[PDB]
Amino acid sequence: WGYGKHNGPEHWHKDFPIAKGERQSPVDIDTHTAKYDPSLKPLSVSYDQATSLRILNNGHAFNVEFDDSQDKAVLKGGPLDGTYRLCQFHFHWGSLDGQGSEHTVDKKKYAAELHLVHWNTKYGDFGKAVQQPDGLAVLGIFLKVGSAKPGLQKVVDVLDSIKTKGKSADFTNFDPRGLLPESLDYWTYPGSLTTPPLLECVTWIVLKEPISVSSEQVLKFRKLNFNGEGEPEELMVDNWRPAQPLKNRQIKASFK
Numbered sequence: 336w337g338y339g340k341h342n343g344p345e346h347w348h349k350d351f352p353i354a355k356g357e358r359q360s361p362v363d364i365d366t367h368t369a370k371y372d373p374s375l376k377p378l379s380v381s382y383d384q385a386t387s388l389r390i391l392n393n394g395h396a397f398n399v400e401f402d403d404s405q406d407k408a409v410l411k412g413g414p415l416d417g418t419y420r421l422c423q424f425h426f427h428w429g430s431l432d433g434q435g436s437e438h439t440v441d442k443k444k445y446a447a448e449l450h451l452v453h454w455n456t457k458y459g460d461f462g463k464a465v466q467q468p469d470g471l472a473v474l475g476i477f478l479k480v481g482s483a484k485p486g487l488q489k490v491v492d493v494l495d496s497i498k499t500k501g502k503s504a505d506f507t508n509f510d511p512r513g514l515l516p517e518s519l520d521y522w523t524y525p526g527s528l529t530t531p532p533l534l535e536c537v538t539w540i541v542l543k544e545p546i547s548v549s550s551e552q553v554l555k556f557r558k559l560n561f562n563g564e565g566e567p568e569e570l571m572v573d574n575w576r577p578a579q580p581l582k583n584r585q586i587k588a589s590f591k
């Protein structure tokens with residue numbers, strides 16, 4: 336599977352038939368049909384103790400991986416009834432600034448989208464968690480182009496070293512607090528992973544406020560490769576799945 340004409344999102348259902356299921360992600364957030372829920376609690380993001388390990392080009396994005404052996408980087412509160420440990424974060428982006436996000440807002444696309452991926456500590460480990468409808472919580476954050484995000488620069492600065500599929504670099508001492516906007520206002524709905532295996536295991540929490548990144552910062556994403564070293568160059572752009580049908584799920588918001 337991939338993001339090409341012959342292996343892209345419109346093909347995934349042939350190997351992963353849940354691609355046409357009832358709680359697929361991403362979705363468009365229609366701000367008129369999304370429901371303000373005053374009962375929605377503030378989100379608790381506790382990343383003070385977050386321990387980054389490595390950054391790697393897995394052939395469809397880059398992932399920063401964390402030590403999730405303890406409650407060092409946990410998401411709780413908001414719509415969640417449990418505690419969720421950060422395993423990895425990655426982004427999706429476009430071939431130009433006008434597209435790249437997975438979620439949309441009133442069908443508007445952003446230049447990129449950051450996903451911080453967390454698993455439910457009821458379930459022992461990540462691989463057990465994804466078998467459960469409440470196994471993961473993904474915090475999604477839109478990227479728009481403007482001022483530079485200082486907290487992203489260490490990520491931008493290492494990407495030249497992981498250009499091709501299978502490359503990795505040590506990536507210690509990275510603090511993901513540097514990737515958060517000021518507000519934790521959010522939309523939330525039940526959904527899925529946005530890549531195969533497309534499991535319907537995710538509580539999605541999508542922040543209202545985008546982070547601003549510079550032109551130069553998002554451009555660096557577009558120099559990565561889907562291919563391995565020595566193989567014909569396939570630039571890693573447009574690694575986003577389009578919005579999928581909401582199918583009567585309720586998107587709730589912490590604001591009107």
Ligand SMILES: [Zn+2]
Binds near residue numbers: 425426450529
């Ligand atoms: Zn993602």
